Amino acid sequence: QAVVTQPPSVSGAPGQRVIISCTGSGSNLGADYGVHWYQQLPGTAPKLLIYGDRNRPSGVPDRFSGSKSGTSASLAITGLQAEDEADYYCQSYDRSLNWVFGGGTKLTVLGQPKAAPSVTLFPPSSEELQANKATLVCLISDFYPGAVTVAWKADSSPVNAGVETTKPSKQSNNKYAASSYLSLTPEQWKSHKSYSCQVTHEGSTVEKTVAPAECS
Amino acid sequence: QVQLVESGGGVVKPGGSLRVSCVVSGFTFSSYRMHWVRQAPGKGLEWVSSITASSSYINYAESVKGRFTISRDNAKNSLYLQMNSLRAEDTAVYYCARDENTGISHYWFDPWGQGTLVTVSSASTKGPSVFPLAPSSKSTSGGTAALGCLVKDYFPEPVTVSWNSGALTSGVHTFPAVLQSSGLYSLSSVVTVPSSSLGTQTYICNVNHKPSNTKVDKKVEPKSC
Amino acid sequence: QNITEEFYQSTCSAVSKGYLSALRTGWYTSVITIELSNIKENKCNGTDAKVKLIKQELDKYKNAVTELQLLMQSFLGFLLGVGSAIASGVAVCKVLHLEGEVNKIKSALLSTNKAVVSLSNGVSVLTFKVLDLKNYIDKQLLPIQSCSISNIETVIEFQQKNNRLLEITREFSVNAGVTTPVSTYMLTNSELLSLINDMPITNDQKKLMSNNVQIVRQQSYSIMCIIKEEVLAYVVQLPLYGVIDTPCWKLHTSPLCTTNTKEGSNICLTRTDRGWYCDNAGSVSFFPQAETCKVQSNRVFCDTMNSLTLPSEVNLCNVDIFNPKYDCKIMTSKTDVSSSVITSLGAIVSCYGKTKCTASNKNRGIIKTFSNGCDYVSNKGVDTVSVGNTLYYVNKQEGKSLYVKGEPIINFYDPLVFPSDEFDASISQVNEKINQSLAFIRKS
Amino acid sequence: VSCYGKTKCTASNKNRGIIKTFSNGCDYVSNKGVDTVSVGNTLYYVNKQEGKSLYVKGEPIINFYDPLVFPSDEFDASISQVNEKINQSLAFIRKS
């Protein structure tokens, strides 16, 4: 019968005020069913932030407040801090679908200086070669915005088959990490003079090149 | 203090069966409705099933009707979820939650558990493939030279690596595993060491695979080019 | 698999468990409207037989409207507390007497028979139109005016369309404008179901209410509210069951006395906390007047207005009456009279004096004779129990019963220093009085 | 509202919710800005009739009695009967 929608992402600066919205239809919020909010940290379980549209449990720092009207609800945070980076959910009740949850909105707080990514291009291993199959190891680490595009460039034609790239992951020093894998064959490794693993970071490009031996 | 502890999660092949449990303490188990909620890795929350205090009324989501079965035992303060004919899209963390309500419009979940992960994968358990990654001139000089080992083709996620039996902890960085289209994992670890210390400091990469007891050791030394 | 019972010989009481709760915690109000006509005395000085019948049916309608207009013109039950039953509906009608609230409702229902209208105070109520006499009278009865009726079925149709209003007027007239059991004239079963379907509650609550509409009717109110312009309005106040499906258990008690041969010199004792017990949220609701709870199979409907909030430790009084955690309430006396209490799955017989006490079934007649004291018999092979000149029938519900043996507690007391006329005492209070009396007698 | 023991007692509004929490003892709340009061597991609606109310402050009379010699089971008593029972109980206390 209905569905609940939520903005995919929201950003803000420390000390400012951000707004998160929850939009329902005539079967959830037009049918007089309340909205409730949950906050989830990167590795913990959800915890209740607001119930009854406006109520706050004991332990919420009074900086969170919500309101509902018609088929819309909002969560307002004033005095944004660095500990507010979390996923936020709104949940209600539907006539046909019963308990329903919003898509989820991840809050980001700005203030971390930009840092160029570092790229390390390990070549095929000598032992790896003996297995009649070799894969080039490319690593990315220490980059703040968690969006880096890795394209494996072999000789003068981009190579797409056998390219496995992981998503960025938050580290203990608040820096993201990534890795790229390119599967090749021993004949292909020595058939091509050199390979390259370029990494793009918001326009900035840093790459490396690696041949079978390239030692003279 | 109110506590909800889930258990029984594990790996299973598509079309299999599994049973999860949740044991509570600190409140009267027989006065409340209970719920199951799941979250896919990197996805949102989804309500699964509910059960009233005396099993009289039961509800399921439309995506699990005919396959899941909720039950409780009030004497042992535990509730159960029996999962049958598992599919790939059933992989997620499962939480047990207690119902809170005002009688008329408001219905929420105030206390949550810790979660239990359930994985539905057709792949078969295989041993890790450990190889050395000796430092090279291109990846040396500067300030320090880096060298590490590689783990390839291992299905179970929990793979642990320790270099000097836990005696090396500075400069060691581990990267997240990568899920291949074949369903197998593979994760590479790199260490940072001084360029002038190359050869004088012994490097060994210990790979412990508990689901196939593959506790190997692989030494990483420079090999010409 | 549901109902079980246990009899405790030490205290002469039995507990029935296996029931499920449905507790009325709040109220829900809705507005029901009927559209009226503004018929004025027509001339139509005819002499036909059908015209006279039509005139009589119009006179009835007008008299009903005038009457409606005239209607609105400018143990342990003593610890409960007093509330006001119809406060919420009366507040809703007090709101409806404001300036533009009838116009708002009238203009929001012309296209549809159901709607949600926001009142001036911000509350949104269901408004539902059940009858439209205006349309049938303005059109099809005074065509643009049927002063010489040519069909007899017109009279019959108009008579059929008018019965609802007359019945509603009668019901409101004999009740001063407030009818507790809501009749099917005020709300038909289909209308009640449609109204339950629109409440903002969960589907479990809707299933509970849809299968027990006869209890919902018994626990509802109807309030004559206002009749202005061409609208008749009254409020229907429905129960809200906030707590459902929790365990519930009933307690039965009978007097416990000594069996001395001498007519006097005998002391008695009774537990005074008989009633219904249901646990809703970390505690127990107790209803001393068990007459205020309706039972449907193994579902009990109780009203929290007639309950006390007790700790969960009260249940220890059934297992051990001398526990220190909770002080159990008793009553002491000196009059021992035989009687019987019919329980869920049996009977308790307190047989004292020279009375003749027996239990029988239809096929074999008497199958047991009781001795002096308190005893219990199950309904497995017993149809009736006779105490003195009275005959009782036992319930024939299916279930298991258990007999628990123990020494009656009235034997542990010394009759010399036993208090007698204690109506609202307890175990600790009786012990304190006994201790004081026993300590006084140390004179030297 | 007579709130005693460990019971939770409050008074609420439709628009603002709880606006008062009661402590142990007897208290009174007007209906000028109150819609319901909840005592324990029960909820009450207050009448919304129009009028004026007044609060008269005094010290409860139950604090003038000594619990040692206080009669405890009386149904049809009065002030004078309680006083004379107290006098009789207190007079008998004579040593030697």
Side-chain angles (χ1 to χ4, degrees):
Chain A
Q1 191 162 29
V3 72
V4 174
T5 298
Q6 210 173 353
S9 59
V10 162
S11 293
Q16 300 291 276
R17 183 178 182 270
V18 292
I19 284 302
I20 301 164
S21 44
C22 196
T23 300
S25 99
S27 193
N28 318 105
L29 299 181
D32 188 359
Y33 298 105
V35 197
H36 317 95
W37 295 92
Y38 302 90
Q39 164 189 85
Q40 202 194 17
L41 321 177
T44 62
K47 68 170 285 292
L48 187 72
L49 271 189
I50 300 279
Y51 71 94
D53 306 285
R54 70 173 150 78
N55 310 333
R56 241 190 281 93
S58 307
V60 184
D62 218 283
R63 293 153 38 215
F64 304 89
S65 70
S67 60
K68 178 201 162 190
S69 72
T71 62
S72 290
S74 293
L75 183 66
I77 318 164
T78 75
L80 198 56
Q81 319 201 341
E83 65 183 1
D84 296 3
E85 293 179 353
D87 278 276
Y88 295 81
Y89 297 85
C90 48
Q91 91 75 31
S92 192
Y93 198 85
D94 192 42
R95 283 189 172 136
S96 293
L97 282 36
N98 310 12
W99 288 268
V100 286
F101 272 104
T105 301
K106 67 184 289 184
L107 186 145
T108 307
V109 54
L110 310 164
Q112 185 169 357
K114 169 87 64 163
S118 174
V119 62
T120 287
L121 182 46
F122 282 99
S125 178
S126 65
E127 167 51 25
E128 173 65 12
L129 288 162
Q130 192 45 83
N132 68 54
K133 64 182 181 293
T135 301
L136 279 73
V137 178
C138 197
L139 301 169
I140 301 168
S141 59
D142 312 297
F143 63 92
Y144 160 48
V148 298
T149 31
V150 172
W152 276 96
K153 182 67 181 294
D155 321 281
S156 325
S157 299
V159 284
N160 315 118
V163 162
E164 298 276 20
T165 309
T166 57
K167 280 73 176 175
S169 79
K170 179 57 46 163
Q171 295 177 181
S172 65
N173 74 334
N174 316 282
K175 298 305 307 208
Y176 281 90
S179 295
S180 199
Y181 291 74
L182 172 73
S183 297
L184 276 189
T185 65
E187 282 65 17
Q188 286 211 13
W189 178 223
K190 297 188 183 297
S191 75
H192 291 126
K193 68 181 178 67
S194 73
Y195 277 71
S196 296
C197 175
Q198 70 101 69
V199 328
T200 57
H201 188 254
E202 213 64 28
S204 175
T205 178
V206 58
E207 77 199 287
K208 213 180 290 273
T209 187
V210 122
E214 76 256 12
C215 287
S216 287
Chain B
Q1 70 285 0
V2 180
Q3 285 275 300
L4 326 173
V5 189
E6 291 86 294
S7 62
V11 186
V12 64
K13 289 183 163 13
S17 287
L18 185 61
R19 185 164 180 257
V20 185
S21 294
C22 167
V23 188
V24 311
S25 61
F27 74 100
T28 314
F29 184 57
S30 73
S31 278
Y32 291 93
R33 184 183 296 114
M34 308 297 296
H35 299 257
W36 282 104
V37 173
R38 80 171 166 201
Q39 181 178 36
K43 299 292 180 68
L45 304 173
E46 170 164 55
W47 170 83
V48 172
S49 193
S50 54
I51 193 172
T52 56
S54 291
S55 305
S56 200
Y57 312 97
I58 298 186
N59 294 292
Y60 296 98
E62 182 65 26
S63 55
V64 308
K65 272 165 205 184
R67 308 187 298 131
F68 290 25
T69 297
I70 195 164
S71 49
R72 67 198 284 154
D73 188 348
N74 275 335
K76 312 195 305 215
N77 297 308
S78 65
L79 73 165
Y80 306 100
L81 192 59
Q82 170 77 50
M83 304 156 70
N84 290 324
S85 160
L86 270 154
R87 312 213 199 106
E89 51 260 28
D90 298 351
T91 302
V93 175
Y94 285 75
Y95 307 88
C96 52
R98 193 183 68 198
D99 191 66
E100 230 51 59
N101 64 92
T102 256
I104 185 139
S105 42
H106 307 319
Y107 302 92
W108 65 103
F109 318 103
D110 178 63
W112 296 61
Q114 287 307 322
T116 190
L117 167 60
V118 165
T119 315
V120 182
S121 190
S122 47
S124 289
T125 188
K126 271 161 51 55
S129 182
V130 188
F131 299 122
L133 321 161
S136 68
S137 304
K138 316 317 298 161
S139 294
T140 207
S141 182
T144 59
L147 62 98
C149 277
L150 182 150
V151 179
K152 176 206 191 53
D153 291 349
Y154 69 99
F155 165 56
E157 172 58 27
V159 163
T160 183
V161 179
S162 76
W163 279 81
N164 297 168
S165 311
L168 185 41
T169 57
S170 297
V172 183
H173 179 236
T174 315
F175 290 96
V178 58
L179 163 56
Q180 291 178 354
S181 64
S182 75
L184 272 300
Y185 303 143
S186 61
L187 89 165
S188 67
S189 188
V190 173
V191 187
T192 287
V193 278
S195 174
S196 45
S197 76
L198 172 144
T200 65
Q201 173 63 43
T202 57
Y203 308 111
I204 299 165
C205 57
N206 310 318
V207 176
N208 171 271
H209 198 243
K210 178 67 181 294
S212 71
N213 309 125
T214 302
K215 329 178 174 190
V216 69
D217 50 350
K218 186 75 195 257
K219 62 180 68 180
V220 181
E221 294 170 358
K223 299 298 293 295
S224 182
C225 290
Chain C
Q1 293 177 335
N2 276 310
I3 313 305
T4 57
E5 189 157 4
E6 286 179 350
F7 173 68
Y8 305 106
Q9 174 175 274
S10 62
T11 56
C12 186
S13 47
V15 175
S16 297
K17 41 188 76 174
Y19 296 88
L20 310 166
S21 84
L23 310 185
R24 185 211 66 73
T25 59
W27 291 114
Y28 191 76
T29 66
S30 183
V31 183
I32 316 300
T33 58
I34 289 169
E35 207 172 14
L36 299 177
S37 184
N38 50 356
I39 193 66
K40 289 290 181 287
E41 292 177 349
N42 305 127
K43 178 183 175 181
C44 198
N45 192 25
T47 193
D48 199 74
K50 294 172 268 289
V51 173
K52 195 157 72 176
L53 295 171
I54 295 281
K55 297 277 197 74
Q56 294 183 24
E57 263 291 300
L58 272 184
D59 283 344
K60 272 174 178 179
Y61 164 84
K62 290 191 278 264
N63 286 355
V65 168
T66 292
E67 188 169 342
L68 279 175
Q69 267 163 350
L70 183 63
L71 199 49
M72 294 300 293
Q73 278 293 10
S74 305
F75 319 114
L76 297 177
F78 64 93
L79 306 161
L80 272 180
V82 67
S84 196
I86 59 161
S88 42
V90 169
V92 175
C93 287
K94 185 193 192 217
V95 168
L96 288 175
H97 280 230
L98 289 165
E99 294 294 328
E101 287 49 46
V102 162
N103 261 332
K104 272 185 270 143
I105 297 169
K106 194 168 159 226
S107 80
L109 263 171
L110 88 158
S111 292
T112 175
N113 278 355
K114 193 158 61 55
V116 204
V117 189
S118 291
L119 270 47
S120 53
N121 60 357
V123 73
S124 288
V125 307
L126 291 174
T127 58
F128 186 79
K129 191 191 304 199
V130 299
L131 183 55
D132 201 300
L133 276 170
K134 184 190 176 160
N135 203 247
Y136 185 85
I137 294 166
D138 290 9
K139 294 179 175 180
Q140 168 168 15
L141 199 148
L142 282 72
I144 199 159
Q145 279 173 341
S146 281
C147 191
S148 294
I149 312 310
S150 56
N151 287 348
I152 185 58
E153 57 269 15
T154 310
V155 169
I156 298 162
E157 198 181 2
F158 185 34
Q159 283 171 353
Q160 296 276 322
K161 279 205 76 60
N162 219 38
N163 205 48
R164 186 89 178 273
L165 187 70
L166 305 185
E167 294 298 324
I168 283 160
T169 311
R170 257 194 279 288
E171 292 177 300
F172 274 140
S173 279
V174 290
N175 281 284
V178 183
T179 59
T180 285
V182 181
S183 63
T184 61
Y185 286 125
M186 308 273 201
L187 260 178
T188 64
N189 189 358
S190 172
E191 292 158 351
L192 178 48
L193 286 171
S194 164
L195 183 63
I196 284 164
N197 189 359
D198 291 331
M199 293 171 63
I201 45 167
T202 55
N203 287 337
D204 306 324
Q205 274 163 308
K206 296 189 184 191
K207 292 182 177 67
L208 175 60
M209 285 172 85
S210 279
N211 297 337
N212 300 278
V213 297
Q214 77 284 332
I215 311 296
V216 169
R217 264 181 201 295
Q218 267 184 331
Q219 296 186 308
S220 284
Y221 292 89
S222 199
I223 309 157
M224 193 50 223
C225 184
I226 189 170
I227 175 158
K228 83 193 287 190
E229 303 169 358
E230 272 167 81
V231 183
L232 174 62
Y234 53 96
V235 170
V236 168
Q237 179 182 294
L238 297 177
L240 169 76
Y241 300 112
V243 181
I244 57 155
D245 211 30
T246 67
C248 291
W249 66 103
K250 194 176 188 199
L251 179 64
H252 311 82
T253 78
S254 295
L256 182 69
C257 309
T258 55
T259 62
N260 280 326
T261 316
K262 191 175 176 67
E263 197 149 17
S265 97
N266 274 318
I267 51 176
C268 289
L269 186 143
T270 314
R271 283 175 76 178
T272 46
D273 50 357
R274 54 166 81 154
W276 273 107
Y277 288 81
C278 295
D279 63 299
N280 40 4
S283 58
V284 186
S285 281
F286 166 53
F287 313 81
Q289 299 153 351
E291 293 177 350
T292 61
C293 288
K294 317 284 191 290
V295 186
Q296 275 291 318
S297 72
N298 67 296
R299 184 79 64 179
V300 193
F301 298 75
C302 298
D303 189 338
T304 43
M305 185 180 288
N306 312 126
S307 80
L308 305 168
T309 309
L310 301 178
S312 295
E313 317 295 335
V314 68
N315 213 354
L316 294 178
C317 282
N318 300 315
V319 189
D320 183 31
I321 196 152
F322 294 125
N323 64 334
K325 290 192 180 125
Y326 193 87
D327 197 38
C328 315
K329 296 182 72 62
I330 54 166
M331 182 179 72
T332 78
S333 178
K334 200 170 263 279
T335 286
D336 49 320
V337 171
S338 313
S339 64
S340 197
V341 176
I342 303 292
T343 68
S344 182
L345 308 165
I348 297 170
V349 180
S350 293
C351 187
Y352 296 116
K354 312 177 143 289
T355 60
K356 179 50 140 76
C357 307
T358 55
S360 312
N361 67 357
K362 65 179 73 174
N363 299 326
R364 305 145 47 191
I366 298 171
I367 54 176
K368 182 175 173 73
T369 308
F370 291 98
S371 299
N372 274 24
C374 175
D375 203 357
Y376 175 85
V377 73
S378 171
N379 76 337
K380 195 64 65 177
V382 166
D383 292 317
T384 43
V385 301
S386 74
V387 178
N389 283 320
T390 307
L391 181 67
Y392 307 75
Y393 283 84
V394 307
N395 300 113
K396 285 303 198 177
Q397 166 81 55
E398 200 72 50
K400 301 182 181 296
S401 73
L402 174 78
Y403 198 112
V404 175
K405 291 179 183 180
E407 183 77 36
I409 65 164
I410 192 66
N411 293 335
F412 297 160
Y413 290 93
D414 180 20
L416 277 296
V417 298
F418 187 71
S420 297
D421 199 79
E422 297 289 323
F423 182 76
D424 186 16
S426 88
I427 288 282
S428 283
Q429 307 184 13
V430 169
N431 272 335
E432 293 179 353
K433 299 174 81 71
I434 283 167
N435 189 359
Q436 295 298 109
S437 282
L438 216 54
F440 163 54
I441 298 161
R442 297 286 295 283
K443 309 185 74 61
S444 308
Chain D
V1 163
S2 288
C3 199
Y4 293 120
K6 307 164 91 71
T7 310
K8 181 68 173 66
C9 309
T10 54
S12 288
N13 296 115
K14 181 175 73 175
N15 290 325
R16 322 208 318 274
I18 300 175
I19 55 175
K20 187 181 174 72
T21 310
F22 298 101
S23 60
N24 296 115
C26 166
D27 205 356
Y28 171 89
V29 67
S30 161
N31 72 344
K32 191 64 66 178
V34 180
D35 294 317
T36 55
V37 311
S38 88
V39 179
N41 283 321
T42 316
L43 177 82
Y44 306 74
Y45 289 79
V46 310
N47 298 301
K48 279 303 199 181
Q49 194 252 322
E50 200 73 59
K52 291 174 71 175
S53 72
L54 176 79
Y55 201 106
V56 184
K57 270 159 194 181
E59 206 270 331
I61 65 166
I62 189 62
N63 297 322
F64 299 161
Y65 292 96
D66 181 23
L68 277 296
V69 298
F70 185 70
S72 298
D73 194 352
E74 294 293 328
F75 185 19
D76 189 7
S78 87
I79 288 284
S80 284
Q81 300 185 43
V82 168
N83 272 336
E84 64 202 23
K85 283 186 175 290
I86 289 167
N87 271 338
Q88 295 298 109
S89 296
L90 215 61
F92 158 72
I93 295 166
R94 55 97 176 172
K95 50 187 169 291
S96 309

